């Protein structure tokens, strides 16, 4: 999704079945993904998977896990409770850690989608 | 036998239609009522939703959750018969919807 246009964001929310949702934990949430979340919420919720990137917070891993628990709590209160999100680290040579990537691909392999009326 | 519906404290019910749309008096006990299809029995009963201002969240066939009511007094407009209040709609608590924390998905 080109992230500068509700003109696209609305109809992608209409057609999509899975949405993996790209927060950056260095910055917390943003109103672009809040807008997209409400558009999906009103047009009918597709299956949402959180992923939080840019975990180069500091050497302060206490801050890292505190921001991660705030993100997962704000995520659970806003898509269904206990929804799945994956913590991606920094990019290593063009792409992400293949461990978390393989686990993510496993979950979307066993996603088991659902009907919506529209 | 341990409850108003089987033994469960809550039961998912399919809303048929909003009772008392055309009541003129706001916040009236005819207005804050709604027909609901019990699934584990499969039959139609009528139920309350408190705060007819937040009646308008639940509309039609939105798998609401149906709890007990428990009249703790003798209110004036309170009709008898109903003992079912609505506690959630489509998964999310409509009390939380009324104080506008959460959001109703569809």
């Amino acid at each position: 999704c080109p992230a500068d246009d509700l003109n696209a964001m609305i109809d992608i929310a209409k057609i999509a079945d899975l949405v993996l949702l790209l927060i950056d934990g260095n910055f917390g949430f943003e109103m672009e993904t809040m807008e997209f979340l409400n558009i999906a919420q009103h047009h009918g919720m597709p299956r949402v998977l959180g992923v939080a990137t840019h975990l180069d917070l500091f050497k302060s891993q206490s801050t890292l896990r505190a921001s991660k628990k705030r993100l997962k709590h704000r995520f659970w209160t806003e898509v269904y409770q206990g929804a799945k999100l994956f913590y991606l680290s920094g990019v290593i040579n063009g792409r992400y850690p293949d461990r978390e990537i393989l686990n993510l691909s496993r979950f979307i392999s066993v996603m088991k989608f659902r009907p919506l009326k529209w | 036998k341990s409850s108003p519906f089987g033994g469960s404290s809550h039961a998912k019910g399919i809303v048929l239609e909003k009772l008392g749309i055309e009541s003129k008096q706001p916040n009236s006990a005819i207005r804050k009522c709604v027909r609901v299809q019990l699934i584990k029995n499969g039959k139609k009963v009528t139920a309350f939703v408190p705060n007819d201002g937040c009646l308008n969240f639940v509309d039609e066939n939105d798998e609401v959750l149906l709890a007990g009511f428990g009249r703790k007094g003798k209110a004036k407009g309170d009709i008898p018969g109903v003992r079912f209040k609505v506690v959630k709609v489509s998964g999310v608590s409509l009390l939380a919807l009324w104080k506008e924390k959460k959001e109703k998905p569809r």
Partner: peptide, 19 residues
């Protein structure tokens, strides 16, 4: 028990739709 089961079996109740 029946207490931890007769409230949790309502997770199997929904609106009947088709896919």
């Amino acid at each position: 028990t029946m207490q931890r089961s007769s409230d949790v079996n309502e997770r199997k109740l929904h609106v009947p739709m088709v896919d």
